[PDB]
Design a protein around this ligand. Structure first.
Ligand SMILES: [Cl-]
Ligand SMILES: [Cl-]
Lengths: 204, 202
């Protein structure tokens, strides 16, 4: 396997998942020149500007191949510093009293995976907004408020004590799948298949 | 000062400079609702999708306010250097794994000078769309990178990344500015944000 393989994903996937594994992938396949780009949505992939996309969406009836990588839950988090100055929410309805940060788009992500008293996902009014989950993580780390982000983005921060998980009982246990998406015709190339195989081992 | 202010910049500027200051700004001006977005180049600003752009790079009516000057640094992780040795001259970079940008290609002309005093142009083993991606690859032991001081200085402080070829690396700095259209300067929240950024960033 040799040559250039272009892999596209959202910033958090590239930084927390791909980048860490790229050194191990390099030792096994030193002749494959990975190109790791970060863009928004499936435009690059569909317009054939990259070979493979690693994304959480569900594209069916597109014709594109999807290979499952891993499942992730959402977590509601804040910095110890924010909680020290603002208090810790003990119910989901108390989030109305706190600074909740969200996406500029898509707005569907601003309906959090934390259930209210009636068992319905809580829609926030974002104080700060951002175009990336990675920016929301940084704002949360620096004490700007409460965010709701994928586990793989914040779990190591929680382990290091840099973020504190909130409203754990109220938080939805449901997971969302992440997939490697690509056109069937590009499965022909060995370097995509060995990258895909590698990704399913290490992420699964 | 009250309402939404949208700030566009490259990822490393947002994560390493803006986000850390956003809580302090919030305490001073709690009624300003920041929107921090990251994109490529000046397209959002030009097409008036954001109020201000923080970028190092002229469709006129633009104003540019200086924020700070930054040097580049060549770095690798301690784990990489233990497995591949540390380069003692710029010319030895040919034997090592150097990671670069997909684009712009001019950025793969590094700020490290060879024996003749020429900036070293690399053949990138791996490429990426963002300097933040290059920082992560570097941290993970994938190779050597050349990135702006504010992206890696703290890692160098913490001992996670090692500065290489310190004497050969250029001392020259490049400016970073807040860029915006003249007409948007009338807005109070843009003015207090700019003032804050100028005070805080140097
Ligand atoms: Cl994201
Ligand atoms: Cl960049």
């Amino acid at each position: 396997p040799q040559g250039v393989l272009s892999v596209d994903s959202a910033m958090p996937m590239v930084l927390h998942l791909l980048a860490p594994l790229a050194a191990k992938f390099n030792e096994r396949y030193p002749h494959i020149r990975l190109s790791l780009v970060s863009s928004e949505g499936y435009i690059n992939l569909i317009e054939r500007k990259v070979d493979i996309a690693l994304r959480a969406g569900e594209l069916d009836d597109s014709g594109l191949r999807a290979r499952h990588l891993f499942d992730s839950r959402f977590r509601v988090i804040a910095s110890p510093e924010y909680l020290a100055k603002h208090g810790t929410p003990q119910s989901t309805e108390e989030l109305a009293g706190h600074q909740c940060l969200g996406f500029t788009e898509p707005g569907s992500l601003n309906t959090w995976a934390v259930l209210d008293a009636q068992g319905n996902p809580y829609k926030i009014s974002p104080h700060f907004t951002a175009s990336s989950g990675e920016i929301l993580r940084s704002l949360c780390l620096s004490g700007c408020g409460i965010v709701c982000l994928s586990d793989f983005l914040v779990d190591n921060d929680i382990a290091e004590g840099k973020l504190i998980p909130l409203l754990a009982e109220q938080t939805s246990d449901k997971t969302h799948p992440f997939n490697a998406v690509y056109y069937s015709d590009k499965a022909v190339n060995l370097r995509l298949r060995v990258f895909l195989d590698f990704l399913v081992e290490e992420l699964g």
